C-alpha cells in the first residue's frame, strides 16, 4: 500500500494528457449543486491531486475537461458531469464509466463505489468510500493528505481496471451495451436532471391547504367511528382498533402483527364504515406528506424547479429509478391524486408538456420472446389484448366479452408476467380459488408458446445461473436451484419476469438515445424531462407540437424491430395533468 503522487499547487501541461482516469469527487449523496471536494488525475505521466478552487478556475483545465478528444475514464460520470454543470463547467470525452461497467457485469453486487468494483477483479489497492468519509452524522471530508491519497487511489484503480472490465464485457457480448447504450444514456440523463421540471408552487400550496382541511374532516370522522382518538398512521394502534376493539376478522398477519394493507382492508369494507374512511385518510395523507410537503421541500426556490436523480446502476432488471424526488410515482389512477400533476408545468411561457407511452410493451415483448402465435397474431391486428385473453379463457366471441370478463382477463395477463399463482389471482379478483386456477390453466392452454417460454426460461436459468434480455443485459439467479420452495419459487418468478421487464427497459433506453439524436439534429427546443419506465415526458414550444406528434411516436416504435409491432400513444397540454 504505497503509491506516489503529486499534490499540485497549479495545473501543468502533463496533467492534460489525451487519456486519463479522472476523479471529480462529490461526497453529498444528492450531487445537485453540491460541493466538489477534490480532483485526481492519473495518466501516462503520473498521478495528480488538485484542489477544486485551483483546477476549476484554471482556463486550461476547464478547456481540457470540455475537450471531447481528451478521453477520461471515471466512476459515476453522471454525478461528476451534473456537479460540474452546477459549477458552470462542461465535461466531455468520458469514454469509460466503471460504475456502469460493473452494473452490467452483475447488478446484484450493488456496486456503488470504486472499491466495490475493484473487488470484482481482486484489486485491493483502494479503500471503500464509507471507510474514508464515515457514516451518518459522522460523515466528514478528511484532512487533505488523506483525501488526496484516496482520490488518487480511486483514479489509479479506474486506470488499472478499465481494460479488465472491458475485456469481460466483450466476452459477455455486453461491450456495445456499455459503450453504445448505457454511456450515451448517462449523458442524456445528466441533461434531463440538470434541466429539471418546473413546479407551480402557488397551485401546489393551494392544493395542500384544501387537502389539510379535507384530511382533518376524515380524521375526525374516523375517531368518531372508532369512538376514540388514535394514531391512524400507526400499524400497531390501528390494528388494535380494527381487530381487538371493533372485533373485525383477521384476514392476514405480518411478522410484527395484524395486516392493514389496502388489499385486506378493502375486503373488510362491508363490515364497518371506518374501514373505507381509513383507506381514504391514508390516501389523502400520502398526498399531503409526499406529493405536497415532500415535493415542496425539494423545490429549488429561486427557479421553482425540481431536479431528480435517475439512478442508472441500481435496479436488478435494467430499469432506472428516480430519487429526491421520485418523479416516476406521481399519482394518476384516482382523480384526487391525479390533480397533483397540474403543478408540473413547462419551464417557459408558451411551452407545453408532451407525454408519449408504449401500449402494453411488456406483453408485446412476451409475445416476441415466447413466439406465441396466438399472442403475436392478436398484436399484429391490434386486437385489444385483454379482450383477446377474455375470449380464450371464457370461450366467448369478442362481442360477448363483458366488462367484468375483460377486468378478470387483464388481471390474468399481467399476473402471468409476474408468475402469479391461483392464490394471488383469486385474492386479487376476489373469486373462488378453484375459478382462479381454471383461468390460469386455460390461459396456458390458449397461449402454449407462453407456457413453453415460462418452462424453458426457468430451465435456462437453472442451467446457466442467469437470464438475459434482448440487448444482452444479465441477471444472475444463484438461488434458482434452492431446495427451499419459497426461495426457489421467487427465483423462478424472477427468471420468468426479468427478460420481459428488462428487455422493455432496453427498448425505451435505446429510444431515448434515438430521440435525443433526432431532436438535436433538427435543432428543436424540445427536450426530455422524464422517463417513467414505459413513457417519455418532454416539453417544447407550442409551435413544435405538430412535429413531436410525428417524431416521438415513430422513434419510439422503431427503436427495435420485434415479431410484433410496437405502439405508442401520445398527448400534450399546458401541464402534465393536461397531457392526457
Ligand X SMILES: Nc1ccn([C@@H]2O[C@H](COP(=O)(O)OP(=O)(O)OP(=O)(O)O)[C@@H](O)[C@H]2O)c(=O)n1
Binding at 317: pick from DNA, ligand X, none (beta carbon under 5-8 Å per type): DNA
Stretch 469-488 residues interacting with ligand X (CB under 6 A): 471-472
* In the complex, least distance from residue 176 CB atom to DNA, rounded to whole angstroms: 23
Among left, alpha and beta (phi > 0; psi -120 to 50; other), residue 472 is left
Kindly report the number of other CB atoms within 10 A of residue 462's CB atom: 15
**What is the rounded CA–CA span in Å between residue 69 and residue 18?**
7
Q: Select the binding partner of residue 324 from ligand X, DNA, none (C-beta < 5 to 8 A, by kind).
A: DNA
Of 409 and 512, CB closest to ligand X: 512
E runs forming strands in 112-270: 197-199
Cell numbers of 360, please? Answer: 402494453
Binding at 112: pick from ligand X, DNA, none (beta carbon under 5-8 Å per type): none
- Smallest distance, Å, CB 174 to ligand X? 5
Q: How far is CA 87 from the centre of its chain?
A: 27
Residue 472: contacted member of ligand X, DNA, none (CB under 5 to 8 Å, by partner type): ligand X
Q: How far is the CB of 47 from ligand X (least distance, A)?
A: 32
The interface partner of residue 198, options being ligand X, DNA, none and the CB cut-off 5 to 8 Å by kind, is none
Beta-bridge partners for 6: 48
Nearer to ligand X, 175 or 422 (CB): 175
Cis peptide before 325 (omega within 30 of 0): yes
Residue 390 and residue 493: Cα distance in Å, rounded?
24
DSSP classification of residue 499: H
CB 306 within 8 A of CB 300: yes
Q: How far apart are the first and last CA of the chain?
A: 59
Residue 379 per-residue DSSP state: H
Closer residue to DNA in complex, CB, 247/525: 247
Helix or strand (DSSP H, E) at 25: strand 19-25
Q: How far is the CB of 552 from DNA (least distance, A)?
A: 17
Q: What is the 3-state secondary structure (H, E, C) of 203-233?
A: HHHHHHHHHHHHHHHHHHHHHHHHCCCCCCC
Please identify, using beta-carbon distances, which residue of 319 and 386 lies nearer to DNA: 319
Work out how close the CB of 328 gets to DNA at its nearest, in angstroms, rounded to a whole number: 6
Residue ranges with strand state E in 117-247: 197-199
From the CB of residue 262, how many other CB atoms can be counted at a distance below 10 Å?
11
Q: Residue 167 or residue 224: which is nearer to ligand X going by CB? A: 167
**Cα–Cα nearest to 22, from 185, 152, 143, 132:** 152
| Least separation in angstroms between CB 420 and DNA | 4
Taking CB under 6 A as the criterion, which residues in 121-180 touch ligand X? 173-177
Find the shortest distance in angstroms from Cβ 491 to DNA: 9
**Out of ligand X, DNA, none, which partner does residue 27 contact, by CB within 5 to 8 A per kind?**
none
Q: Which does 259 bind (CB under 5 to 8 A by kind): DNA, ligand X, none?
A: DNA
Question: Please, which residue, 187 or 421, has the CB nearer to DNA?
Answer: 421
Nearest approach, Cβ of 100 to DNA (angstroms)? Answer: 16
CB burial of residue 430 (10 Å; 0-12, 13-18, 19+): exposed
337/541 with CB nearer DNA? 337
For residue 381, the minimal CB distance to DNA (Å) is: 24
Query: Cβ closer to DNA: 120 or 494?
Result: 494
What would the grid cell of residue 460 be? Answer: 435456462
Judged by beta carbon, residue 181 or residue 375, the one nearer ligand X is 181
DSSP annotation string for 30-85? S-TTPPP-EEEEEETTEEEEE-HHHHTT-HHHHHHHH-TTSEEEESSHHHHHHHHH
Residue 168 or 219 with smaller CB distance to ligand X: 168
Give the residues lining the site for DNA (CB under 7 A).
136, 231, 233-237, 254-257, 259-263, 265, 279, 282-283, 286, 289-290, 293-294, 297, 311, 314-317, 319, 321-326, 328-334, 337-338, 415, 418-425, 427-428, 486, 489-490, 493-494, 497-498, 501, 532-535
Q: Are 460 and 429 in contact (CB under 8 A)?
A: no
List the one residue out of 532, 83, 31 whose CA is nearest residue 326: 532
* C-beta of 202 vs 236, nearer to DNA: 236
- Min dist CB 235 to DNA, Å, is 5
Contact pattern from residue 370 through residue 399 relative to ligand X, giving x for each residue in contact according to CB under 6 A and a dash for the rest: ------------------------------
Q: Which of residues 420-479 bind ligand X (CB under 6 A)?
A: 471-472
Separation between Cα atoms, residue 310 and residue 524, nearest integer Å: 24
DSSP helix, strand, coil percent of the chain (3-state; round to 5)? 55, 15, 30
At its nearest, how many Å lie between ligand X and the CB of residue 178? 7
Q: Which does 562 bind (CB under 5 to 8 A by kind): ligand X, DNA, none?
A: none
User: CA 428 to CA 440: how far, in whole Å?
Assistant: 13
- Sheet containing 19-25: which strands, arranged edge to edge? 6-7, 46-50, 38-43, 19-25, 71-74, 94-97
Question: 125 vs 517, which CB is nearer to ligand X?
Answer: 517
Least distance (Å) from ligand X to the CB of residue 456?
Answer: 19
* Binder of residue 175, out of DNA, ligand X, none (CB less than 5 to 8 A by kind): ligand X
Q: Which residues bind ligand X (CB under 6 A)?
A: 173-177, 471-472
Amino acid at each position: 500500500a504505497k503509491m506516489a503522487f503529486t499534490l499540485a499547487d497549479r495545473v501543468t501541461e502533463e496533467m492534460l494528457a489525451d487519456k486519463a482516469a479522472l476523479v471529480v469527487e462529490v461526497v453529498e449523496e444528492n450531487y445537485h449543486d453540491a460541493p466538489i471536494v477534490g480532483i485526481a488525475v492519473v495518466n501516462e505521466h503520473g498521478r495528480f491531486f488538485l484542489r477544486p478552487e485551483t483546477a476549476l478556475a484554471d482556463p486550461q483545465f476547464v478547456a481540457w475537461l470540455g475537450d471531447e478528444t481528451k478521453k477520461k475514464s471515471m466512476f459515476d460520470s453522471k454525478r461528476a458531469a451534473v456537479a460540474l454543470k452546477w459549477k458552470g463547467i462542461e465535461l466531455c470525452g468520458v469514454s469509460f464509466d466503471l460504475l456502469l461497467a460493473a452494473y452490467l457485469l452483475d447488478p446484484a453486487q450493488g456496486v456503488d463505489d470504486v472499491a466495490a468494483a475493484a473487488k470484482m477483479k481482486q484489486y485491493e489497492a483502494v479503500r471503500p468510500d464509507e471507510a474514508v468519509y464515515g457514516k451518518g452524522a459522522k460523515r466528514a471530508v478528511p484532512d487533505e493528505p488523506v483525501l488526496a491519497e484516496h482520490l488518487v487511489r480511486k483514479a489509479a484503480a479506474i486506470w488499472e481496471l478499465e481494460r479488465p472490465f472491458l475485456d469481460e464485457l466483450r466476452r459477455n457480448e455486453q461491450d456495445r451495451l456499455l459503450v453504445e447504450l448505457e454511456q450515451p444514456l448517462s449523458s442524456i440523463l445528466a441533461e434531463m436532471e440538470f434541466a429539471g421540471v418546473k413546479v407551480d408552487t402557488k397551485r401546489l400550496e393551494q392544493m395542500g391547504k384544501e387537502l389539510a382541511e379535507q384530511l382533518g374532516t376524515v380524521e375526525q370522522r374516523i375517531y368518531e367511528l372508532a369512538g376514540q382518538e388514535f394514531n391512524i398512521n400507526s400499524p400497531k394502534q390501528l390494528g388494535v382498533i380494527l381487530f381487538e376493539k371493533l372485533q373485525l376478522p383477521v384476514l392476514k398477519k405480518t411478522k410484527t402483527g395484524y395486516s392493514t394493507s389496502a388489499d385486506v382492508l378493502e375486503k373488510l369494507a362491508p363490515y364497518h364504515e371506518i374501514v373505507e374512511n381509513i383507506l381514504h385518510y391514508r390516501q389523502l395523507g400520502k398526498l399531503q406528506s409526499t406529493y405536497i410537503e415532500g415535493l415542496l421541500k425539494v423545490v429549488r426556490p429561486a427557479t421553482k424547479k425540481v431536479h431528480t436523480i435517475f439512478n442508472q446502476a441500481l435496479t436488478q432488471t435494467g430499469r432506472l429509478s428516480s430519487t429526491e424526488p421520485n418523479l416516476q410515482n406521481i399519482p394518476i389512477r384516482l382523480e384526487e391524486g391525479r390533480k397533483i400533476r397540474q403543478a408540473f408545468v413547462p419551464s417557459e411561457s408558451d411551452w407545453l408538456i408532451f407525454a408519449a407511452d408504449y401500449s402494453q410493451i411488456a406483453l408485446r415483448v412476451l409475445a416476441h420472446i415466447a413466439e406465441d402465435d396466438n399472442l403475436m397474431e392478436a398484436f399484429r391486428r391490434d386486437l385489444d389484448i385483454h379482450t383477446k385473453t377474455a375470449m380464450d379463457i371464457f370461450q366467448v366471441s369478442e362481442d360477448e366479452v363483458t366488462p367484468n370478463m375483460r377486468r378478470q382477463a387483464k388481471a390474468v395477463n399481467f399476473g402471468i408476467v409476474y408468475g402469479i399463482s391461483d392464490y394471488g389471482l383469486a385474492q386479487n379478483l376476489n373469486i373462488s380459488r378453484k375459478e382462479a386456477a381454471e383461468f390460469i390453466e386455460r390461459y396456458f392452454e390458449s397461449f402454449p408458446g407462453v407456457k413453453r417460454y415460462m418452462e424453458n426460461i426457468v430451465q435456462e436459468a437453472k442451467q446457466k445461473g442467469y437470464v438475459t434480455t434482448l440487448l444482452h443485459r444479465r441477471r444472475y439467479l444463484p438461488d434458482i436451484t434452492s431446495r427451499n420452495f419459497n426461495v426457489r419459487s421467487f427465483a423462478e418468478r424472477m427468471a420468468m419476469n426479468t427478460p420481459i421487464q428488462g428487455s422493455a427497459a432496453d427498448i425505451i433506453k435505446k429510444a431515448m438515445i434515438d430521440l435525443n439524436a433526432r431532436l438535436k439534429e433538427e435543432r428543436l427546443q424540445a427536450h426530455l424531462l422524464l422517463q417513467v419506465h414505459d413513457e417519455l415526458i418532454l416539453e417544447a414550444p407550442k409551435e413544435e407540437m405538430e412535429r413531436l406528434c410525428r417524431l416521438v411516436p415513430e422513434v419510439m416504435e422503431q427503436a427495435v424491430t420485434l415479431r410484433v409491432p410496437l405502439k405508442v400513444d401520445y398527448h400534450y397540454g399546458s401541464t402534465w395533468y393536461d397531457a392526457k
